[PDB]
Design a protein around this ligand. Sequence first.
Ligand SMILES: N#Cc1ccc(Nc2nc(N)nc(Cc3c(Cl)ccc4[nH]ccc34)n2)cc1
Lengths: 425, 543
Amino acid sequence: SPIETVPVKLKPGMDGPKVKQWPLTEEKIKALVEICTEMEKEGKISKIGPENPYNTPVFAIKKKDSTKWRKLVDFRELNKRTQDFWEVQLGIPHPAGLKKKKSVTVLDVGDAYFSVPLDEDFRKYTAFTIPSINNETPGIRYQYNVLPQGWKGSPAIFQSSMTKILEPFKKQNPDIVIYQYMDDLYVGSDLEIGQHRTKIEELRQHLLRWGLTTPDKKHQKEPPFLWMGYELHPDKWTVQPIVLPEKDSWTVNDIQKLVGKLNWASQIYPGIKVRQLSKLLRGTKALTEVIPLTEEAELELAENREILKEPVHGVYYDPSKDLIAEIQKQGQGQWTYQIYQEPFKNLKTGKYARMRGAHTNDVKQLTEAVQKITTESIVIWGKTPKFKLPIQKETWETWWTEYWQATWIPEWEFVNTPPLVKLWY
Amino acid sequence: PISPIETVPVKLKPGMDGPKVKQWPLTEEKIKALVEICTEMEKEGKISKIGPENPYNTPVFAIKKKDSTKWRKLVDFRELNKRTQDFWEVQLGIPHPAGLKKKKSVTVLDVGDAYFSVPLDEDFRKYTAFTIPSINNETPGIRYQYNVLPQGWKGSPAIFQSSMTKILEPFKKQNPDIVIYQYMDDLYVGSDLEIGQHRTKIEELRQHLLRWGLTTPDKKHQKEPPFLWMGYELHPDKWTVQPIVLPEKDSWTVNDIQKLVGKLNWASQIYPGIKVRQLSKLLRGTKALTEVIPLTEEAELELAENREILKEPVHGVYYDPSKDLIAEIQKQGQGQWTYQIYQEPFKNLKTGKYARMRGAHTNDVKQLTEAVQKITTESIVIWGKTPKFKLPIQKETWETWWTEYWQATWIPEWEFVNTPPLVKLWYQLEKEPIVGAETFYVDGAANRETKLGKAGYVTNKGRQKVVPLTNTTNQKTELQAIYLALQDSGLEVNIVTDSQYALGIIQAQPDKSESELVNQIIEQLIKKEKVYLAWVPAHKGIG
Ligand SMILES: N#Cc1ccc(Nc2nc(N)nc(Cc3c(Cl)ccc4[nH]ccc34)n2)cc1
């Protein structure tokens, strides 16, 4: 079934990726070894020689924890080096209302690409290496021979095939918005969940009887309490915990704190003066001392509780800019998070939590609040953010994979100074 | 030596062409000196006479061994290298002895004339061109071309090792009893077959190799242990660092202290408790290479203890997958931590150290986790699995720290090991102020130019102190103030600070910094029974 390949040319003055493979657990080497061995047979990937200096990293994640793992190729570098000229020469338009649907489900169609053969030239740029424990051996080296998962040129080149396989469905059902971000299809409906769920498996099987396998066969009529439909509900996306406390009594400290939070609101809402509250502190009084109010003090409070309950403007989304996603440990499995592009011009703040306790650690959480915040980004603006993760690089670099489930990888960095920006939120 | 060997197609960087660097004339003795090395070379087919207009040339230079038992041919491929494509970086990571699995026999193999045994991409042959002169225009210069891997080219080690791997692979599979490790020209073979077989199997290997043009004058498995490799003394069932020498000198210069720290860090792999803070604290070298620098007092003591340690040979054992992989850490003190990883009680697998890389503030618990962190990454690279940590900290202290810590962490499985010093929080600040406690509106700034300031305070109870400081900064005074406040306050206190700087320094609850002020403040925090620092905006903030 040889198809005509589609020429891939990186931006000129750009050479292929040469990123180094992170060291892995023997367990994971073992899995990748098996997986690649199999792909080698299917002819998906092929062994390469030393005349190929290129290398993008590969990890091993647990699909849906079943007996097997999935191989996860971090094509972040090869993407910047291409897909950015393939966000162009092959842009996949983003439906500005998928975030409006009552329900969005995400299905893994990535496995489609695997048929389409990869441009004979561009292959070399995909080489990846299965590492050896304690370097006792030369990494195992492979390069792709078909469109690969994780590399944004795959949904771009398959786009043709996709919009066709889906056409005679996007018909019967003309109100469902379907968006393809990388290896995932984001189906959005306004149906009562029950129907949506069906409509999706309606689609699930449509694709299926036309070739496209989608593992989103989460489970069977037996309820062992596994987590339900990657059903996002972007019509409930919102937030206003810019919550000042409404207390019975107010102390010197209380205000002090208050007058504080209200001061950083200063670059978020240049609208709240505190001289009226803060003046009730020009004195060097006790701290535990409770002291009721002052003049427009209460007005400055009841009035701020308002402009603060009414979001700011000028805050528009620039597609030229990148999405920056700051997160923060809040304690007791709670994590608050902002998505912005310019300081204090939040495009969307938010929060996350799991069920706090004797089963979840911080990393798994973080690793989650990230895949959560990411997805949200994809749905809303069709593009992942760059996470400013409050965590030590190496620690994160060792475990992120453990609880990772997305077939993609945002861009991230590590902060080591989170101020009481934790307070304000 | 091989048509059966498959050549790796080579290429010149995108828009470049082949080297053209004319040959300088050399002494007549050398011309034939090369002509001998070359005809017996072309004879061996390693190289080949080439006809006019292979516009590409590279410099040849007969070199004397300085022992003059014979002469040696040497080419300068710098320019070819600068023009050949990149290859897959080999040896970018090297195995650590502590990760090699316990084996019986291990026999190295000096695979000799190796680079000249592997063929060379036909097309990339024309750039290897080099000309040997004919005695000053006497002739068209004896001109050769390479058909094997030029002994100093760019993709030689790679293409070699690649090619080798392919050659072993067959045999390697016909024997899961033998494991092989390639190292440049080396070939270390190991096994668990009765030494009688293992010696019979190496015979085989060797013959296998031999049929592939790859020779090994190394018959009987010549070279014996302890094997010298990347600076390791590797014995049959033990390993260590190739002996080191910490010279004793009168005056120490930068290039001197550097090789010293280098030697010391390096010996740390297996020599317990080696410290290096002080010796390096010196190297904040505004990198003046021969800037003579006087060992400080501690540096002199530090280096001392290292000697006491180094003198006495210490070894490391190998890996037995079948046993656990344990790791233990113990705090030295000035931000220094040391660890050893083991399976058994007395002989270690490997050791090492960790210190908070200069940053004026940090806590013991934080430091201990960063240590645990480094060990985890080391374990994953060496053994492919995290180890069981045995740490000088109590679940209660640890878990209370990660819960209050703003940054996320991951504490693998660990056990408590009561053996001081002990990692513990010497004081916790009050979350809510303290009822009745004299609030200290602490404050203190300075004049950036004049380098003069004052730290003082005013309390509810109308107590006001103001002290003058000469030669300090707004930062210095902001803590100077807080400190002050602690001094005068009773055993419970409320302090209102205008500086986040001061806030954070203390809020992280650092347990140390050679920064005598913070020490004083820290020592004072430990003494009190209830302290509450609370932050309030500066300028506008208060009056
Ligand atoms: N797990 C495991 C494992 C690791 C290595 C081998 N093979 C092996 N074991 C020993 N003791 N020495 C040698 C030879 C060898 C030397 Cl001279 C020096 C550094 C080395 N690094 C690498 C191999 C090696 N090979 C076999 C199994």
